[PDB]
Amino acid sequence: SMQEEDTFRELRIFLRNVTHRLAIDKRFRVFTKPVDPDEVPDYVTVIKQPMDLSSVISKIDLHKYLTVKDYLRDIDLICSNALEYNPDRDPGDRLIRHRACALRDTAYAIIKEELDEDFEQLCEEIQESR
Numbered sequence: 001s002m003q004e005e006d007t008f009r010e011l012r013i014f015l016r017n018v019t020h021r022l023a024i025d026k027r028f029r030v031f032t033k034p035v036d037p038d039e040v041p042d043y044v045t046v047i048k049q050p051m052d053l054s055s056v057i058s059k060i061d062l063h064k065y066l067t068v069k070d071y072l073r074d075i076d077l078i079c080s081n082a083l084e085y086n087p088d089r090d091p092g093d094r095l096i097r098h099r100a101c102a103l104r105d106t107a108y109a110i111i112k113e114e115l116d117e118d119f120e121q122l123c124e125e126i127q128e129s130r
């Protein structure tokens with residue numbers, strides 16, 4: 001219905017705003033673009049499901065997220081990919097992991113403070129009906 005389309009549009013607007021706040025945070029610059037395969041050529045073969053904030057924005061616009069839970073699964077994937085690609089004790093890896101965890105924690109904290117659970121529940125119940 002019209003009212004359901006309005007609901008998903010509000011969800012997209014909400015998710016774009018949250019993603020934008022993540023993307024302008026200097027800590028998260030490394031997660032704003034997909035990995036360049038001329039800098040780490042083996043990235044695309046190790047990491048089977050690359051995810052980054054540019055891709056998340058593209059998926060919002062393609063109406064791929066019908067719930068906040070769907071969105072957070074991709075934020076979680078940005079984080080978990082980073083933990084797996086950079087597992088070592090050296091400072092470069094530890095810095096990336098810390099930023100990845102912070103990205104994840106920041107998204108969840110924004111959602112906890114700013115998302116009405118009844119709005120999420122509505123999105124879920126529409127998504128289950130289609």
Ligand SMILES: Nc1cccc(-c2nnc(-c3ccccc3)[nH]2)c1
Binds near residue numbers: 081
């Ligand atoms: N999940 C995700 C999304 C975008 C980038 C990355 C990433 N993981 N590790 C790197 C990296 C590794 C060595 C030097 C600089 C960045 N970048 C990981």
Ligand SMILES: [Cl-]
């Ligand atoms: Cl840096």
Ligand SMILES: [Cl-]
Binds near residue numbers: 087
């Ligand atoms: Cl190590």
